[PDB]
């Protein structure tokens, strides 16, 4: 795992909420036809999985791109602020699907074998040229933990 | 919730991420008609789903019921021990797939907005008859994290 420390920057694209019907894997599908109406992105070939979690504790999701502010955000979609954190950065290895997977065995397991100690605040998926589709097992996606 | 609990054995089907396709709901689905198979069953309205950790590292799951021992495993199951914990109980309310999104969530947040500090272990879900199917948003299952 690769250690990293950004600063605070802003996503735009579009949401699920853990409280009907929707999933994660449907958000992608009606994002992609709609994903080159956003101006001002920092860097088209990648896009984020934003993990986060309302005050309530409710699980949120945004599907988005990095954007210099200033933009526009489209009809159906929203900014979202992901706040300067550390991050220890896992490879993972599978499918879309299978970051759930990858999410629980690194926050039950592979944190505590390493050392590094979660600090609660926005984790991220992030997809680039190794992701080559959501069912294809040789896809790679950067899982982003937030960490102390 | 917090809940102590001695070391109990499961025997049920194994799903692993190496196999191209393959998703724990499937194995739940080969499951399902050779359940019937297992004897010795401590409670057959009850089942586990198992999320462990391979010597190597991956994710591991297992779908399967507590057993008494010393009743045999069926061809293509396998027996799981669980060892002795003490776990945080939440109560998942959606459907089974969404499961992983409450993982995240008590990992990321929960676990430490109520002072609690996982302890590397054996992981599980537990299904009663508060839950009516895979996707059905009105199921509950309980999530049991080991933790100090
Ligand atoms: N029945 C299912 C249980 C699942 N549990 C998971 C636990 C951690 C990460 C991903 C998970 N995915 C599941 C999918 C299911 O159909
Ligand atoms: N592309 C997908 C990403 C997902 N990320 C998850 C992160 C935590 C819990 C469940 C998740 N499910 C996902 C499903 C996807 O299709």
Redesign the pocket.
Known sequence: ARIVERPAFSVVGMEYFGSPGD???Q??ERFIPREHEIAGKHDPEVSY?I?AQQPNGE?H?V?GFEVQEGWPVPEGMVRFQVPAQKYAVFTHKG???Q??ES??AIYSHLLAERGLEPKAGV?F?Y?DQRFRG?LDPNSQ?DLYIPIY
Do not use: H, K, S
């Open positions: 999933t994660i894997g958000l992608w999985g993990c699980f999701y599907a499918t879309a699907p970051i759930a999410f629980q984790d998926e997809y959501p996606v």
